[PDB]
Design an enzyme around this catalytic site. Structure first.
Site, mmCIF file in Angstrom:
data_model
loop_
_atom_site.group_PDB
_atom_site.id
_atom_site.type_symbol
_atom_site.label_atom_id
_atom_site.label_comp_id
_atom_site.label_asym_id
_atom_site.label_seq_id
_atom_site.Cartn_x
_atom_site.Cartn_y
_atom_site.Cartn_z
ATOM 1 N N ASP A 116 24.177 22.701 5.972
ATOM 2 C CA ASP A 116 23.301 22.483 4.814
ATOM 3 C C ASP A 116 23.208 23.672 3.869
ATOM 4 O O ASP A 116 22.240 23.774 3.119
ATOM 5 C CB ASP A 116 21.887 22.050 5.207
ATOM 6 C CG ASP A 116 21.876 20.753 5.966
ATOM 7 O OD1 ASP A 116 22.228 20.757 7.162
ATOM 8 O OD2 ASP A 116 21.520 19.720 5.364
ATOM 9 N N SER A 117 24.173 24.577 3.867
ATOM 10 C CA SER A 117 24.248 25.585 2.823
ATOM 11 C C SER A 117 25.347 25.230 1.830
ATOM 12 O O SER A 117 26.238 24.429 2.114
ATOM 13 C CB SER A 117 24.500 26.969 3.415
ATOM 14 O OG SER A 117 23.299 27.547 3.882
#
Ligand code: MG
Ligand code: ZN
Ligand code: ZN
EC number: 2.7.7.6
Lengths: 56, 140, 69, 19, 46, 56, 266, 112, 115, 391, 147, 118, 49, 233
Positions: free
Chosen positions: N188-189
């Site tokens: 999720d980056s």
């Protein structure tokens, strides 16, 4: 429960987190402004008189 | 230094598997009827088909002189004479199993970085192989 | 709110092509793809820069100015 | 397959052409 | 703003199941639009 | 149910076994009926287990 | 000459298309990165806003003005802003431009980049001119003005590289491709049935022989014959982009040599 | 896997396994120790089948013996062709008195 | 706010040099040079040209963190060959090839007349 | 912070941005994701508490969880996928990349290992380079199904003296699993060596994955023509079986299983048929997917996704269930006003036959929305209830 | 966040010369991870990326209404008509070394939304500060330099 | 204030759920020397525990940070914790540990005699 | 583009969220639990306007 | 929609025909001189009908007119359509996509997603950043976030044309690669192009309004907006 058994504390910091593959497992990346804010009181010895004087 | 084992093998079948660069070959010795070979071959550098005669040679070192890897590998300089010069395909790996198939049949297992090779046969020529690193030298 | 000066990814200057894009659209009766190809926007980054841009600047100019000289 | 585009200007011109 | 102007609110002490999406909610409220908080399913958007 | 029973050869064979499942807990007179093993009867309610067998 | 070889396929006003042969992969990639990020260029850096009655924010206008491509032929004669002896800016290390736009018209007045006026003395240099590319004669649309709206501001343009900020990049997009036939097998083509079918051939496939599909994989083959297309933003001509990129890379390596010789005597 | 007989041949031990492997065959006190060890193993098997009625072999236990065995094999380069240096009395006594050193409670009274 | 002001990708800071040559104790005739205010653009080029050298056993570079514009480059050569001399030879070769590339480019550009 | 591993002692590295930056492998015990999570910091102000924080609450000292006597940290996500891709038998690394990978290991001893292939070209295998990160004296042996000393599938593991012999490195090896590489290393070499191993493996695998690249795309969820026809045939024959059971029950010929009514037995048979249909269709799609399929690579790596994710994206979403049963008749004797009364067909009561790739019919969309709403409600109540129980 | 529940923060920012790039020189504005896709089963993200690529190439904005008869195969045919790979994969090149990435990368425009959870509005630290009037503990809230 | 759909769990927050479900001697005595077990019959472990080693390191580093006389040779080391670990390495920490039994009795173990295996 | 539909109270734009309630004047029959002595309950929430 | 028996075609058919649709587009384009034809014109002619949940209990509704209404080789890429094998419909859906709310109508292909992801996006779209009103320059709202360069989405829904999303968008069309590039985008980056950020990608304004008031607590207990001086304050 709100003021004695757990409580708000000083010398704390809070921000969002990011992954870093280049950091070690036991290592954390602290922001410079947070590091400029949070302090650790270090006692003056002969072993660190020069380093602490330079920091002062 | 010297060839710990050397023979001529007939490739019965070449199995590609699910690998598009590595094929596990099935080989049987021509001179000895109880010696056969299974070996994984990186085929874009050494393409083999079925019914191919291969001179399989296992040596403990590549230098022409006797043995004195604890030394760092280096790229070969110009004019460096090694045993690899006489072979079309040279691997390097370690022994990891010596299991006896029968009273006389000993099987030797080699792993060249994950490319596995089982060589089995009677022990009167496979007795040279022990627990060390060995170079596998192949020419067609 | 107004057309961006440069494409976000590549950096091709597209801020000078907006009014010519409007001219290629509204009186030349070209479709949008031929209009972008006419301006030389061959990479689709520039194409989404001009194609997807919404011009709020005219919606902002409809208000009477706060300081009128 | 169907055309996956919202192109409503062109039937605006088409409907003006029938008008 | 548009989503906020079309919200509902269900004041929850009964023994029904007002949080799950019901079959009769078809075409009247949004099937997938609700907060993930404690008001999940209670706050519905038309 | 398929329980594991020590075979006479020494192995543990997966011997099938007819096991009665029951809903609703009574234990005191259920364990006293013949034809069952009252040393292996198990109850979902541990409370009745404590009342009938014991605390351990 | 012996070494890298260049054959231009297409040369335009803002596009060179050349085949870069007889060169290592790392040198081609480093040259690509250098024209992306390392070439000095003049661009607007500080904006002094005097009058802004626009519907846009002040720093909105400033950020738009920073991205205006300025002419940068004589950019080498200019000096770096912190390397100059002056206080903030001077004619030796900066170019000052102004923009005075008024909404005198009933209709909306477009503020183009051609309305920028250079007020510094250039000393005969060839820098500071806003780049005009369209046939309309205007420039980049900076802002819009209705009647009675005024925009008066002063821009100080300094020099810098794209590493500091992308507004100093003359790079646009640099196409870069080697081995279109995948003869080096540097890619494994994802496919459903036939990788030769789902993958369209690039236009550079015409300049190389297709593989013979029976020949062995040439393991000794190395990457060369690079197909590069450089696009000029407009600050400098694209040939000057490539030449100044070679200049910058050569000067970086020469600086490494200078530092090595400087510590070598110590 | 466990029964070793020095007085018979159905559960004999090969003399090639250890240097004291030929002349050890036909000993009595060593056979007594081996019978004691086998009786202990039989009682252990009975106790384990009493405890784990499902016959589950895999259980959470503190010290991974297998990894220590493999580490000793690779550390001392066990070729499994040389006869072993161990006398069987030393093995039995070592296994027996290792359990005395496995101290969880250091009390010196009966119940502890 | 915590972001460094971005000239520090390519400005040599006060009290620090471009290079930092430290000998490597892990291998004989090996050093590690910390290039300061560069990145992969120079590191890959120097690495590849050092690998083209024949008397160089080892040549590798790494950027340990993208936050800091620096990389450590490690050279191990054959005996009797200074890794500093290998670095000088690699840099000289890059200078010569870039100059030849330059001259080829201007000549073959001047051949073009459609610009 | 439900457990003690969720708040531990780290070492400061001052960085020039606004984020607490931390290793990827330590995110699992924190249950942390970088979707905007805040996460607290505390600085001791005395040497006593500093020392006991470093000697008691440190990250390496708490690699092995006392919760389930297995490591709580492991190689995850991109590093797991890249360590599976790197230790394939096809993976050979050229000298120029090998030297960079070797230099990326901080504790590399400075000797270049001899290539697995010397002639006609020096090539190192991925296992060979990965074994450099593994310290010497480490011996790990694991046999999967169909694993012998020769591994045709290259499954299982064998590590000897910190050198990988065969087997692809996978979630069963460097994941948070008992008896894996992490557990063995931290029990034989200590916690500091295991933390250094975490760093070394992460660095070398991330570098190789950087210079190798890994993606996923819309094409990775696409089964070809014949497999899609086979999936459609499986769904159709399951619908035929459900229709036959429906005709039997409507003629009342369906017997009732013991202790359970005709309605519940019929529903049990229908749900069983639909579930085994979805599983069979997903298995067909999974057999179709090549080894180059990206989602297939991720699934066999164990880094993300599972079999059911491939099944739902590519073959069939399946039967939507609300509180354990099918979609109830919210209307009078029907689920939606687009169906007739007393319709017990699978499409009428919440079986989604289309995959996510082909998109959902609006009835199927609403039924799947009902299922997802149930999932969200269950999550919301379960979090509060389990926090209550934990306190 | 995207339009599909795929939210997250920026890990790091690279300049253009470090990011991967196509043969056309197009670099991404943004790189997400493949691991966001299979666990969440977010296929419409990929379909939106494909349709947006076709829309940008053709100039006609894409119809992404839910229950239309728009298939991925038609979008693939349209993308193949534009000279790109039909499933949206592209041959990328590594930014650092210029070498081809061994695996091709799914590429294309995708509509992303900026969310309001800026780190500068949320970063907070306190060594010593004001006390509560009653409990004499650190105050609440980062706006008051709280604990 | 703020209006966030980003579901952040406000923590230590189970009293919503409490309100949801609210309805459902002879060896040792006084302070004699008998609490001090003699060294010959100490029944605790000779191995110094993780908490014991942590508190010895903390106490020794705190003392060294306030100019306690270091009893080992310094190798240029300046950090008090590493000096304390060096002191513990060759048993030069002049401390003893008072392990309290649950009945109030205690045993005295010196750091010199405690085995540091962890 | 502003659509209205809200109130300006003390300069704050306030929106009335539609409060969702059960309908009146409808007969609803519910089954109570086993320990309750009443099996079924017929209830009407009678309402007049 | 209203489904009538329609004995002319021998089967059930919608009362709306192409002539009514043509009149509707004529009115809509004249809005951009003929007889006015509005929604109420359809309502008063029995062409459409208002149905609530009670009246939904006693009717049969078709998904699409072109599929379910006429009496009944197939494309393998399309989703499977069941025709329900019954022709007694009383109504037909206007469009099935209209069952969604305002926020869910922004989602491109919401039928191709897992439903919790659609719920998350519906909750997340309220936190998007973009132009909220065109008069933001004259509103002293407490907090205001305005994107520099909003862009309408390339993949756009027919429904969001009525939400005016193409006029007041809340995001940008970013070129997105799905790659494990450097390990800095894991789980999720993102890795965002810094050069794009320099050129204005997702750059946005932030307005905060501070309100202050002087009040009289009585006769002389009041306060004044003034610049204080250290001598007397
Ligand atoms: Mg999170
Ligand atoms: Zn562009
Ligand atoms: Zn100056």
């Amino acid at each position: 429960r709100g003021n004695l058994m757990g409580k708000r504390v000083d010398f704390s910091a809070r921000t969002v987190i990011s992954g870093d593959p280049n950091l070690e497992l036991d290592q954390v990346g602290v922001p410079k402004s947070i590091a400029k804010t949070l302090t650790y009181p270090e006692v003056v010895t002969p072993y660190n008189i020069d380093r602490l004087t330079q920091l002062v | 230094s010297n060839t710990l084992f050397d023979d001529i093998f007939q490739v019965s079948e070449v199995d590609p598997g699910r690998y598009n660069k590595v094929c596990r070959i099935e080989a049987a010795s021509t001179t000895q009827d109880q010696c056969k070979l299974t070996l994984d071959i990186n085929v874009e550098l050494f393409p083999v088909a079925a019914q191919d005669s291969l001179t399989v040679t296992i040596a403990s070192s590549l230098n022409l002189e006797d043995t004195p890897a604890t030394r760092s590998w280096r790229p070969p300089q110009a004019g460096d004479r090694s045993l690899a010069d006489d072979y079309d395909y040279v691997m390097y790996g370690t022994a990891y199993k010596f299991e006896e198939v029968s009273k006389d049949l000993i099987a030797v297992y080699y792993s060249f970085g994950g490319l596995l090779m089982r060589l089995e046969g009677n022990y009167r020529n496979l007795n040279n192989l022990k627990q060390e690193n060995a170079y596998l030298l192949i020419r067609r | 709110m107004i057309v961006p000066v440069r494409c976000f990814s590549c950096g091709k200057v597209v801020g000078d092509k907006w009014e010519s894009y409007l001219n290629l659209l509204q009186e030349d009766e070209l479709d949008e793809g031929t209009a972008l190809s006419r301006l030389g926007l061959k990479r689709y980054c520039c194409r989404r820069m001009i194609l997807t841009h919404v011009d709020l600047i005219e919606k902002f100019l409809r208000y009477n100015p706060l300081e009128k000289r | 397959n169907a055309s996956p585009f919202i192109k409503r200007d062109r039937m605006r011109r088409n409907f003006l052409r029938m008008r | 703003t548009l989503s906020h102007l079309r919200r509902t609110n269900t004041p929850i002490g009964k023994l029904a199941k007002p949080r799950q999406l019901h079959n009769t909610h078809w075409g009247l409220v949004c099937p997938a639009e609700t907060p993930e908080g404690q008001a999940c399913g209670l706050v519905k958007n038309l | 149910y398929d329980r594991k029973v020590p075979s006479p050869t020494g192995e543990y064979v997966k011997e099938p076994e007819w096991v009665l499942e029951t809903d609703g807990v009574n234990l005191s007179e259920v364990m006293t009926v013949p034809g069952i093993d009252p040393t292996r009867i198990y109850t979902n309610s541990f409370i009745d287990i404590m009342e009938v067998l014991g605390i351990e | 000459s012996e070494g890298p070889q260049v054959k231009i396929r297409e040369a335009s006003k803002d596009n060179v298309d050349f085949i870069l042969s007889n060169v290592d992969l790392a040198m081609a990639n480093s040259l690509r990165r250098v024209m992306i990020a390392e070439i000095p260029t003049l661009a607007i850096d500080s904006v002094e806003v005097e009058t802004n009655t626009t519907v846009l924010a002040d720093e909105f206008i400033a950020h738009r003005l920073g991205l205006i491509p300025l002419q940068s032929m004589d950019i080498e004669q200019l000096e770096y802003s912190r390397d100059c002896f002056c206080e903030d800016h001077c004619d030796k290390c900066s170019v000052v431009l102004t923009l005075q736009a008024f909404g005198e018209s009933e209709s909306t007045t477009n503020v183009y980049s051609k309305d920028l006026v250079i007020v510094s003395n250039l000393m005969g240099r060839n820098i500071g001119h806003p780049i005009i590319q369209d046939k309309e004669g205007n420039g980049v649309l900076i802002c819009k003005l209705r009647k009675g709206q005024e925009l008066k501001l002063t821009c100080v343009a300094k020099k810098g590289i794209a590493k500091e900020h992308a507004k100093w990049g003359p790079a646009a997009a640099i196409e870069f491709e080697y081995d279109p036939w995948n003869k080096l097998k540097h890619t494994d083509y994802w496919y459903e049935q036939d990788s030769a079918k789902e993958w369209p051939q690039s236009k550079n496939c015409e300049y190389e022989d297709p593989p013979n599909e029976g020949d062995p994989f040439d393991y000794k083959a190395q990457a060369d014959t690079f197909y590069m297309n450089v696009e000029s933003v407009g600050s400098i001509p694209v040939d000057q982009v490539v030449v100044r990129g070679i200049d910058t890379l050569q000067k970086k390596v020469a600086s490494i040599l200078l530092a090595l010789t400087q510590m070598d005597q110590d | 896997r466990y029964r070793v007989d020095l007085l018979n041949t159905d559960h004999t031990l090969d003399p090639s396994l250890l240097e004291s492997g030929s002349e050890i065959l036909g000993d009595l006190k060593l056979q007594v120790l081996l019978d004691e060890e086998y009786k202990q193993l039989v009682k252990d098997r009975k106790f384990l089948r009493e405890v784990f009625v499902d016959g589950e072999a895999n259980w959470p236990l503190p010290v991974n013996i297998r990894r220590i065995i493999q580490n000793a094999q690779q550390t001392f380069h066990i070729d499994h062709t040389k006869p072993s240096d161990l006398t069987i009395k030393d093995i039995v006594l070592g296994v027996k008195d290792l359990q005395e050193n496995l101290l969880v409670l250091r009390g010196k009274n009966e119940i502890i | 706010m915590n972001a460094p002001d971005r000239f520090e990708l390519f400005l040599l800071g006060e009290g620090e040099s471009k290079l930092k040559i430290d000998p490597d104790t892990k291998a004989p005739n090996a050093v590690v040079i910390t290039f300061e205010k560069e990145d992969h653009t120079l590191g890959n080029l120097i690495r590849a040209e050092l690998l083209n050298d024949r008397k160089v056993l080892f040549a590798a570079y790494k950027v340990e963190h993208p936050f800091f514009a620096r990389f450590k480059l490690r050279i191990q050569t054959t005996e009797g060959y200074d890794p500093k001399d290998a670095l000088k030879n690699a840099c000289n070769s890059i200078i010569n090839k870039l100059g030849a590339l330059k001259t080829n480019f201007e000549t073959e550009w001047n051949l073009q007349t459609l610009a | 912070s439900l457990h003690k591993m969720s708040m531990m002692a780290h070492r400061v590295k001052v960085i020039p941005y606004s984020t607490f930056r931390l290793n990827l492998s330590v995110t699992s015990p924190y249950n942390a994701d970088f979707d905007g999570d805040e996460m607290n910091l505390h600085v001791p102000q005395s040497e006593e508490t500093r020392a006991e924080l470093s000697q008691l609450c440190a990250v390496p000292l708490q690699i092995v969880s006392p919760q389930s006597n297995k490591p709580c940290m492991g190689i995850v996500q991109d590093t797991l996928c890249g360590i599976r891709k790197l230790t394939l038998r096809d993976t050979f690394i050229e000298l120029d990349q090998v030297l960079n990978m070797l230099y990326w290991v901080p504790d590399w001893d400075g000797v270049i290992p001899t290539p697995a292939i010397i002639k006609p070209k020096p090539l190192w295998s991925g296992k060979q380079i990965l074994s450099v990160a593994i310290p010497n004296g480490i011996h790990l042996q694991r046999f999967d199904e169909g694993t012998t000393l020769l591994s045709p599938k290259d499954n299982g593991m064998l590590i000897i003296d910190g050198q990988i012999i065969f087997g692809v490195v996978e979630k069963k090896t460097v994941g948070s699993s008992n008896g894996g590489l992490i557990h063995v290393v931290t029990r034989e070499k200590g916690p500091q060596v295991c933390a250094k191993l975490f760093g070394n493996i992460q660095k070398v695998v991330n570098f190789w994955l950087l210079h190798n690249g890994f993606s996923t795309g819309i094409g990775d969820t696409i089964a070809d023509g014949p497999t899609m026809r086979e999936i459609t045939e499986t769904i159709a024959e399951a619908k035929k079986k459900v229709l036959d059971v429906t005709k039997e029950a409507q003629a009342n010929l369906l017997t009732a299983k013991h202790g359970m009514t005709l309605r519940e037995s019929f529903e049990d048979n229908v749900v069983r048929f639909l579930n085994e249909a979805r599983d069979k269709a997903g298995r067909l799609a999974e057999v179709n997917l090549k080894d180059l399929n990206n989602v297939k690579q991720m699934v066999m790596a164990g880094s993300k996704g599972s079999f059911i994710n491939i099944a739902q994206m590519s073959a069939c979403v399946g039967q939507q269930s609300v509180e354990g049963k099918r979609i109830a008749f919210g209307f009078v004797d029907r689920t939606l006003p687009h169906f007739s009364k007393d319709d017990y067909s699978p499409e009428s009561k919440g079986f989604v036959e289309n995959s996510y790739l082909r998109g959902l019919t609006p009835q199927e969309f609403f039924f799947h929305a009902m299922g997802g709403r149930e999932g969200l409600i269950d999550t919301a109540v379960k979090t509060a209830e389990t926090g209550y129980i934990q306190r | 966040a995207s339009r599909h529940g795929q939210k997250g923060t920026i890990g790091i920012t690279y300049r253009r010369e470090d990011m991967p790039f196509t043969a056309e020189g197009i670099v991404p504005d943004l790189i997400i991870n493949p691991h966001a896709i299979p666990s969440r089963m977010t296929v419409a993200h990929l379909i939106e990326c494909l349709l947006s690529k076709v829309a940008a190439l053709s100039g006609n904005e894409g119809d992404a209404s839910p229950f239309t008869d728009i298939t991925v195969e038609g979008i693939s045919k349209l993308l193949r008509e534009h000279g790109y790979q039909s499933r949206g994969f592209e041959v990328m090149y590594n930014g650092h070394t210029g070498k081809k990435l061994m695996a091709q990368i799914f590429f294309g425009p995708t509509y992303y939304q900026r969310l309001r959870h800026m780190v500068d509005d949320k970063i907070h630290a306190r060594a010593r500060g004001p006390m509560q009037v009653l409990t004499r503990q650190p105050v609440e809230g980062r706006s008051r330099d709280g604990g | 204030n703020e209006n966030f759909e980003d579901f952040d769990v406000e923590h230590f927050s189970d009293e919503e759920t409490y309100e949801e479900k609210p309805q459902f001697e002879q060896i040792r005595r006084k302070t004699l020397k008998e609490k001090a077990i003699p060294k010959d019959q100490r029944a605790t472990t000779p191995y110094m525990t993780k908490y014991e080693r942590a508190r010895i390191l903390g106490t020794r580093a705190l003392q060294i940070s306030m100019n306690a006389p270091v009893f080992v040779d310094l190798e240029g080391e300046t950090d008090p914790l590493r000096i304390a670990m060096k002191e513990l390495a060759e048993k030069k920490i002049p401390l003893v540990i008072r392990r309290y039994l649950p009945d109030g009795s205690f045993e005295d173990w010196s750091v010199e005699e405690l085995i540091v295996d962890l | 583009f502003d659509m209205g539909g809200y109130f300006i109270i003390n300069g704050s734009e306030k929106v009335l969220i539609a409060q969702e309630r059960s309908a009146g004047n409808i007969v609803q029959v519910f089954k109570k639990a086993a320990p309750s002595p009443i099996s079924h309950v017929a209830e009407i929430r009678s309402a007049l306007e | 929609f209203i489904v009538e028996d329609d004995e002319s075609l021998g089967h059930k058919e919608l009362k709306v025909r192409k002539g009514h649709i043509a009149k509707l587009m004529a009115t809509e384009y004249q809005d951009i001189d003929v007889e006015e034809y509005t929604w109420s014109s359809l309502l008063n002619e029995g062409l459409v009908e208002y149905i609530d949940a009670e009246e939904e209990e006693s009717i049969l509704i078709a998904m699409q007119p072109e599929d379910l209404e006429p009496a009944e080789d197939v494309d393998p890429a399309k989703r499977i359509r069941v025709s329900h094998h019954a022709t007694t419909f009383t109504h037909c859906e206007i469009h099935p996509s209209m069952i969604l709310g305002v926020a869910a109508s922004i989602i491109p292909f919401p039928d191709h997603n897992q439903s919790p992801r659609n719920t998350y996006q519906s909750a997340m779209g309220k936190q998007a950043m973009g132009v909220f009103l065109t008069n933001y320059n004259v509103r002293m709202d407490t907090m205001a976030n305005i994107l520099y360069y909003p862009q309408k989405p390339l993949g756009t829904t027919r429904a969001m044309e009525y939400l005016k999303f193409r006029e007041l968008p809340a995001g940008q069309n970013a070129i997105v690669a799905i790659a494990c590039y450097s390990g800095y985008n894991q789980e999720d980056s993102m890795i965002m192009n810094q050069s794009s950020i320099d050129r204005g990608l997702f750059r946005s304004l932030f307005f905060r309004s501070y309100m202050d008031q002087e009040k009289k607590y009585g006769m002389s207990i009041t306060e004044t907006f003034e610049k204080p001086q250290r001598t007397n304050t």
